[PDB]
């Protein structure tokens, strides 16, 4: 088990119905925030991934949670659509050429804790390590590719300092 990713079944996900595959290795990573509630325990962040997926599935009518992975302030990564299934998180130009990771919260006036950030970068290395990502992958913030405040001012200024970030 590559990163220490919480599997779909462990956060009680509805089964996915998405079919569209991403072509590896993938070039881009897009970092979003959920603009949802935050959580900082495994129990609270499992519920929160449930809740986000529930909105996407029941309400937006999507095949699964839109993000490939979610990050909790518990410092764990929650399997969304995964490495191999095209996401619904950054519009039609970016969904097919990226992995979308989303921090569970609103980081406009808040920073995610260092454990959340470590879990994100550990996830990405793990992606390289598996061949899901390019070794020279490029990180975009959600607002760099779509009109939105996502991932929040505070979170966005941090991912700007990441070695793989490209505006």
Ligand X SMILES: N[C@H](CCC[C@H](N)C(=O)O)C(=O)O
Candidates 57, 38, 33; CA nearest to 48 is: 38
Q: Report how far residue 144's alpha carbon sits from residue 152's, in angstroms, rounded to the nearest whole number.
A: 12
Build a one-symbol-per-residue string for 43-62: x at contacts with a copy of itself by CB under 8 A, - elsewhere.
Answer: x-------------------
- Least Å distance between CB 127 and ligand X? 10
For 83, the token pair is 């490495």
Instruction: Give the one entry of ligand X, a copy of itself, none that residue 65 binds, where binding means its C-beta sits below a cut-off of 5 to 8 angstroms depending on kind.
Output: none
- Largest interatomic CA distance in the chain: 38
As measured in angstroms, the least distance from the Cβ of 88 to ligand X is: 25
Residue selected from 82, 105, 119, 149 as contacting a copy of itself according to rule CB under 8 A: 119
Of 58 and 130, which has the nearer Cβ to a copy of itself?
Answer: 130
Q: Which of 8, 29, 64, 74 is in the footprint of a copy of itself by CB under 8 A?
A: 74
The answer to whether the bond into 22 is cis (omega within 30° of 0) is no
Sheet with strand 133-141: strands edge to edge: 5-6, 77-79, 69-71, 98-103, 26-33, 133-141
Tell me: does residue 82 bind a copy of itself (CB under 8 A).
no
Which of 5, 30 has the CB closer to a copy of itself? 5
């Amino acid at each position: 088990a590559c990163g220490s990713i919480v599997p779909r079944r462990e956060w009680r996900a509805l089964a996915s119905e998405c079919r569209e595959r991403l072509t590896r290795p993938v070039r881009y990573v897009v970092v979003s925030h959920t603009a949802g509630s935050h959580c900082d325990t495994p129990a609270s962040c499992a519920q929160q991934a449930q809740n986000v997926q529930s909105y996407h599935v029941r309400n937006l009518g999507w095949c699964d949670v839109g993000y490939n992975f979610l990050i909790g302030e518990d410092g764990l990564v929650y399997e969304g659509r995964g490495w191999n299934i095209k996401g619904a998180h950054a519009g039609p130009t970016w969904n097919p050429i990226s992995i979308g990771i989303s921090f569970m919260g609103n980081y406009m006036n808040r920073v995610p804790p260092p454990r959340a950030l470590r879990a994100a970068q550990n996830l990405l290395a793990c992606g390289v390590a598996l061949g899901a990502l390019r070794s020279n992958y490029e990180v975009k913030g959600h607002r760099d590719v779509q009109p939105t405040l996502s991932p929040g001012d505070r979170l966005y200024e941090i991912i700007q300092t990441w070695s793989h970030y490209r505006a």
